[PDB]
Design a protein around this ligand. Structure first.
Ligand SMILES: [Mn+2]
Ligand SMILES: [Mn+2]
Length: 155
């Protein structure tokens, strides 16, 4: 499988205390205003956060006002073209619209994981991402799928 697509879904953020990574409240009369930026790290997945590419260069995928624990439902897509990758890491930053949490959902990419095609690429299990701070207090969940694509479709 020398040409394949990785899609990772940031499923949901849970912040019952409505706090920041520094542990104070996002909003003292309201809830967090979470802004989600993310990036699927193929080149330095086993390195410390942020990995290969700096957070400030990531695309904004989800936004919300006064929802500590929003459902997200949004994908980050990456393609491995012309060779093999053994894992990938969905690096996520969450800010209060100010750091809520830096997360890392590392994902194996063994042969098991990359389906022969898109229709046969079932989502894998929901996985909790690793946070820099507030482990278990501010949680982020995400799942992966991967499937072979034709080379002319690989970005
Ligand atoms: Mn797709
Ligand atoms: Mn707010």
């Amino acid at each position: 499988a020398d040409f394949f697509r990785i899609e990772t879904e940031i499923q949901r953020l849970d912040n019952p205390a409505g706090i920041l990574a520094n542990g104070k409240k996002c909003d003292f009369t309201g809830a967090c205003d979470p802004v989600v930026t993310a990036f699927l790290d193929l080149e330095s997945p086993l390195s410390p956060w942020p990995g290969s590419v700096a957070a400030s260069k990531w695309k904004t995928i989800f936004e919300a006002t006064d929802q500590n624990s929003p459902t997200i439902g949004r994908s980050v897509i990456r393609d491995m073209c012309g060779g093999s990758a053994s894992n990938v890491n969905l690096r996520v930053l969450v800010n209060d619209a100010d750091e809520i949490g830096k997360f890392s959902c590392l994902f194996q990419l063994d042969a098991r994981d990359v389906a022969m095609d898109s229709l046969s690429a079932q989502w894998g299990p929901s996985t909790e991402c690793t946070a820099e701070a507030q482990q278990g207090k501010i949680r982020l969940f995400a799942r992966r799928r991967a499937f072979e694509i034709p080379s002319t479709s690989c970005r």
